[PDB]
């Protein structure tokens, strides 16, 4: 009563009462696909098969490369070269996971490349230059790997991934890129600024100094014509450590929707007049992190303002409410919170919000 064949080369048994049944993913992948009738009565699970495991064969080649123990910059370059083609939830999850191991390997090589003797002529300088060059290479490749992954036409794989895993994988994207940013900041030579940006992801890692009088920091300067985040000169001095502050701003286009509206703390009002009211992240995700702090609620001396633009600008979105994504590093699962953030002004094109934390 519950057997059928799907377009992705997957047939099924007839489970007289919704019994488990799986068949391999279509020729060209390595995963499988389960699909049993929702009710024991005998009705196809309308959700269809879960193509959440199938992944392109490039996964295996990179896996052995991670084993070969080569410099992670080369592996990161190779990953982007493959992610140009059609993407899969398995490829997404594999790249997300890979971007976590490469950091560990880099950490190992950074620990290894440490002065271990008298600097005869330029040994320490050569080690530092090699590190900075390789680390700049890693983050430059990371902006490319995320450019490829957040391709607008690649949302089909993101939707295939279950709601629970799609927010978790996206949360890990936010976590691995900020780790890479802070690593780049820690390996900058003399308080310089690095800005590797692309159509989807824009990144600015800048190691600044708290000496004398300092200026404010704004990202992006004028690119994006909107969605601009800004800190204050006083905040820089507050989060200063021994005349050094590692700052990292990032703007993500085409990632917001993948983040689910779990436990959203929007404050609604009289405008709520829909029996089937829905919520939508109608704004590009802007992000800022300071002094190697992931999620510890660091309070700011002066507020942080972000004029995030509207994805869909018409009069069908009754009211706005600014939010922030809080996630537990251990579970990599998070939720939208309006805590410490208050709407300033709103209109059709943009919306400025004031938060107390970064």
């Amino acid at each position: 009563s519950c057997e059928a064949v799907e377009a992705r080369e997957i047939m099924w048994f007839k489970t007289r009462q919704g019994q488990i049944a799986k068949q391999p993913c279509p020729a060209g992948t390595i995963g499988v696909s389960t699909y049993l009738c929702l009710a024991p009565d005998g009705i196809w699970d309308p959700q269809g098969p879960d193509l959440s495991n199938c992944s392109s064969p490039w996964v295996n080649h990179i896996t052995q490369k991670l084993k070969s123990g080569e410099t992670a910059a080369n592996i990161a370059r190779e990953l982007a070269e493959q992610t140009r083609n059609h993407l899969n939830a398995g490829d997404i999850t594999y790249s997300v996971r890979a971007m976590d191991q490469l950091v560990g390997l880099l950490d190992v090589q950074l620990r290894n490349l440490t002065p271990g003797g008298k600097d005869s002529a330029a040994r320490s300088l050569n080690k530092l230059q090699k590190r900075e060059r390789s680390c700049r290479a890693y983050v430059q490749a990371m902006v490319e790997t995320v450019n490829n992954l957040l391709q607008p036409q690649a949302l089909n794989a993101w939707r295939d991934l279950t709601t629970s895993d799609q927010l978790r994988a996206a949360t890990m994207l936010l976590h691995t890129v900020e780790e890479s940013a802070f690593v780049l900041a820690d390996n900058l030579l003399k308080t310089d600024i690095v800005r590797e940006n692309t159509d989807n992801i824009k990144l600015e890692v800048a190691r600044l100094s708290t000496e004398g009088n300092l200026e404010d920091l704004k990202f992006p300067e004028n690119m994006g014509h909107g969605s601009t985040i800004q800190l204050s000169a006083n905040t820089l001095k507050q989060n200063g450590r021994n005349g050094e502050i590692r700052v990292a701003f990032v703007l993500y286009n085409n990632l917001g929707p993948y983040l689910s509206t779990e436990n959203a703390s929007m404050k609604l009002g009289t405008e709520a007049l829909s029996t089937n009211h829905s919520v939508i992240v109608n704004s590009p995700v802007i992000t800022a992190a300071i002094n190697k702090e992931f999620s510890n609620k660091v309070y700011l001396a002066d507020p942080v303002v972000f004029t995030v633009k509207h994805i869909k600008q018409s009069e069908e979105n009754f009211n706005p409410n600014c939010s922030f994504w809080s996630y537990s590093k251990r579970t990599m699962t998070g939720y939208w919170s309006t805590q410490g953030c208050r709407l300033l002004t709103t209109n059709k094109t943009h919306t400025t919000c004031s938060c107390n934390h970064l």
């Binding site: 919520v279 109608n282 800022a288 706005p320 939010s323």
Partner: peptide, 11 residues
């Protein structure tokens, strides 16, 4: 910290 605006979409 990721920042964005959560809106509505009356249907």
């Amino acid at each position: 910290t990721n920042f964005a605006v959560l809106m509505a979409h009356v249907e």
